[PDB]
Every structure is written in structure tokens, then in C-alpha cells.
Amino acid sequence: TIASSRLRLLEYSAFMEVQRDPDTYSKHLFVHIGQDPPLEAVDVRQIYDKFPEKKGGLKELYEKGPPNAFFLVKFWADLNSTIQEGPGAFYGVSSQYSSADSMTISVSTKVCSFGKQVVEKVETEYARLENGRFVYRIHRSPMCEYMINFIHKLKHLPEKYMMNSVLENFTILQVVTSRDSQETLLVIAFVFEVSTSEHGAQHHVYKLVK
Numbered sequence: 001t002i003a004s005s006r007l008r009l010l011e012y013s014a015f016m017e018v019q020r021d022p023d024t025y026s027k028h029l030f031v032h033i034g035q036d037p038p039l040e041a042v043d044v045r046q047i048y049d050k051f052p053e054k055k056g057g058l059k060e061l062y063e064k065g066p067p068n069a070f071f072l073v074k075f076w077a078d079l080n081s082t083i084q085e086g087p088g089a090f091y092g093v094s095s096q097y098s099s100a101d102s103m104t105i106s107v108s109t110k111v112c113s114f115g116k117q118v119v120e121k122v123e124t125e126y127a128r129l130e131n132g133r134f135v136y137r138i139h140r141s142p143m144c145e146y147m148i149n150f151i152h153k154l155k156h157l158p159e160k161y162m163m164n165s166v167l168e169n170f171t172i173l174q175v176v177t178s179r180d181s182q183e184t185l186l187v188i189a190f191v192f193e194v195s196t197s198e199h200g201a202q203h204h205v206y207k208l209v210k
């Protein structure tokens with residue numbers, strides 16, 4: 001469970017959806033996190049090299065704190081072409097959060113490639129009271145053309161070891177802050193590999209410590 005003292009990640013999924021006919025849709029999940037067990041710890045200094053981006057970077061954010069907001073998710077992305085991709089295929093990202101307190105949050109998603117920030121998405125979300133808790137939803141946020149082209153380039157590689165060498169240099173840094181106070185609520189560093197398993201995409205969550 002990815003949760004700080006102020007915010008919990010309920011769900012996260014990167015996917016592509018193709019419309020076979022007006023009433024039929026197929027959805028392929030590249031990565032997914034759904035739905036508390038104790039988490040294994042990873043020293044944050046072991047991944048500073050993987051996130052070398054200076055301003056809005058990991059080292060600076062960790063020093064600002066609180067340390068309880070920092071998590072690392074290692075993904076094994078399912079890049080198998082299970083669904084037949086056609087012309088109007090939608091590539092998107094959906095995520096949900098919850099908190100005990102009502103807040104306006106700001107979700108910044110930094111996509112990095114070769115140690116350089118390539119895309120940054122900033123989305124403001126308002127609290128919705130739901131079953132005594134406050135929920136935040138980012139539904140079907142479209143992937144930018146950079147990310148759709150990166151996935152095609154990855155799928156067109158003749159070997160899964162070649163895709164791992166590319167994914168070695170690809171990271172995503174998600175920073176959720178309170179909109180008005182600018183306080184760090186949740187930080188998730190994402191690192192990637194290609195899934196070799198028949199059980200599809202897999203992930204491992206770690207608590208970042210110092």
C-alpha cells in the first residue's frame with residue numbers, strides 16, 4: 001500500500017483501448033496497481049543516479065520532506081500486443097487517491113528519458129467526500145504523443161533485452177502536493193523493465209529511506 005500520513009494511492013494504470021466496433025472495446029494494461037503489508041526499504045541514495053534531474057528532482061524533494069511520502073515502484077510492463085491496435089486507439093492513464101482530510105491536490109508527472117525531463121503533466125484535483133473519506137480521480141488522462149511513440153518504438157524492438165536497455169533510462173517521477181500550501185503529500189518514483197512472465201504485468205513497492 002502506497003500511503004503517506006496525508007494521502008493514499010488507491011489505483012494507478014497505464015493502458016491502451018481499441019474500439020473493435022461501436023459496441024466493443026478492448027483494453028490492454030501496460031502496468032497496474034489496484035485496491036496493509038509491511039514494505040521493504042530501499043535507500044534513496046541508491047536511486048539518485050537513476051533520477052539525476054536537478055530542479056524538481058528527487059534529492060531536493062527528499063531533503064524538503066516529509067520522508068514518509070517517498071515510495072519507489074518497480075514495474076514489469078506488459079508490452080505484449082494482446083489486442084489488435086487500429087486507427088483510433090486511446091492511450092491513457094487513470095489514477096485514484098484518498099485522504100482523511102479535504103484538500104485540493106496538484107499532481108505533477110515528470111516523464112524522464114536519458115536523465116532528461118521530456119514531458120511534464122500538471123493536474124489539479126478537487127476532493128470528493130465518499131464513504132467518510134475524500135477521493136481524487138484522474139480518469140483516462142490521455143498519454144502525450146511522445147509516450148505513444150515511445151511504446152511503439154519499444155514494441156518494434158526485436159529482443160526483450162533491447163527493450164530493457166531502453167527502459168533502464170526511462171523513469172517517471174510523480175509528485176503530489178497540496179495546491180495552496182505546496183506541501184509534499186506523496187512522491188512515487190517509477191522504474192521499469194519488460195515483463196517476461198505469463199501472468200502479465202507485475203510490480204514491487206518499496207519505501208524510500210535515508
Ligand SMILES: O=C(O)c1cnc2c(cnn2C2CCCC2)c1
Nearest residue numbers: 014030031077093109143144147
Ligand atoms: O503518465 C504517462 O504519460 C505515462 C506514460 N507511459 C507510461 C506510464 C506508465 N507506464 N508507461 C509506459 C512505460 C512502458 C509501458 C507503458 C505513464
